[PDB]
């Protein structure tokens, strides 16, 4: 086989590689993440084709002048399945959620996520179509 999954994991840009590596070593049964990894600010579960999962996190855990990375920890996928997430304030002001897809070609459909700081909490809706 014949296994395919995506997840959505958030950490500081510095902690990204460490989270990816220990995630690989934790295996499929643990959603390819080390349980209770302190470096992981928020994460979805691992989902197969046709499934969906969401995660919500406090915007208080972020900071305006820091680099944050979102990525999939499924072994090898973090090469192309990564992107930046940054905190900003846009004149508006809201949308406090985003819809992300990972497909069969190791791709997220966005590579940059903006979180407004008027949001007290932020919501990621991950799907895995096909
Ligand atoms: Cu196999
Ligand atoms: Cu993936
Ligand atoms: Cu957790």
UniProtKB/Swiss-Prot annotation:
Domain Plastocyanin-like intervals: 3-88
Subcellular location: Periplasm
Gene Ontology cellular component list: periplasmic space; plasma membrane
Domain of life: Bacteria
Main location: periplasm
Binding locations of Cu cation: 6, 72, 77, 81
MF-aspect GO terms: copper ion binding; electron transfer activity; identical protein binding; transition metal ion binding; zinc ion binding
Keywords (A to Z) from UniProt: Copper, Disulfide bond, Electron transport, Metal-binding, Periplasm, Signal, Transport
Main function: Transfers electrons from cytochrome c551 to cytochrome oxidase.
Protein name: Azurin
Native species: Pseudomonas aeruginosa (strain ATCC 15692 / DSM 22644 / CIP 104116 / JCM 14847 / LMG 12228 / 1C / PRS 101 / PAO1)
Gene: azu
Segment of the intact protein contained: 63 to 148 of 148
């Amino acid at each position: 086989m014949g296994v395919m999954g995506h997840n959505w994991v958030l950490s500081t840009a510095a902690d990204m590689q460490g989270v990816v590596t220990d995630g690989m070593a934790s295996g499929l049964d643990k959603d390819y993440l080390k349980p209770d990894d302190s470096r992981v600010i928020a994460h979805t579960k691992l989902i197969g084709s046709g499934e969906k999962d969401s995660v919500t996190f406090d915007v208080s855990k972020l900071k305006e002048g820091e680099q944050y990375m979102f990525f999939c920890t499924f072994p090898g996928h973090s090469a192309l399945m990564k992107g930046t997430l940054t905190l900003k304030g846009i004149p508006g002001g809201a949308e406090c959620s985003v819809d992300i897809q990972g497909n069969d070609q190791m791709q997220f459909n966005t590579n940059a996520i903006t979180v407004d700081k008027s949001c007290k909490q932020f919501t990621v809706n991950l799907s895995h179509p096909g």
